[PDB]
Amino acid sequence: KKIFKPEELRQALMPTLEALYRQDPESLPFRQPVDPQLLGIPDYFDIVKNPMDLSTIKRKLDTGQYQEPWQYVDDVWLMFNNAWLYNRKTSRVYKFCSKLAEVFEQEIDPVMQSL
């Protein structure tokens, strides 16, 4: 089975994550873990079983937690799908998620081809 070294995943994939981070205004609510008490959404973990955010994905890259590039892509999509599930379609977070998904698609395609 092909092994992907953690530094090699990090070098290839981190620019795609940085592209999301730098999207302002749309990345802002995704830059840190959801804090249900602080955001006034105490039902969040009942609806979203597996929370995910940009900083957690960065930490996983930094600490070698992905064996396969598709596992990173899965976490980015988990983050998106959580937002499209929890929020209504009129909301900022929903529409900001849609923008991030558009940006990500463009960034990730050449990278995954190359891997």
Rounded to the nearest 10 degrees, the angle between the axes of helix 6-21 and helix 92-114 is: 150
Cβ 114 to ligand 69A, closest distance in Å? Answer: 30
Cβ 74 to ligand 69A, closest distance in Å? Answer: 18
**Closest residue to ligand 69A using C-beta atoms:** 29
Nearest 5°: phi and psi at 23? Answer: -75, 110
- By C-beta, is 28 or 50 nearer to ligand 69A? 28
List interacting residues with ligand 69A (CB under 6 A). 28-29, 34, 39, 41, 83, 86-87, 92-93
Cβ(12)–Cβ(111) below 8 Å: yes
Cβ 22 to ligand 69A, closest distance in Å? Answer: 16
| Residue 95, both tokens | 């529409």
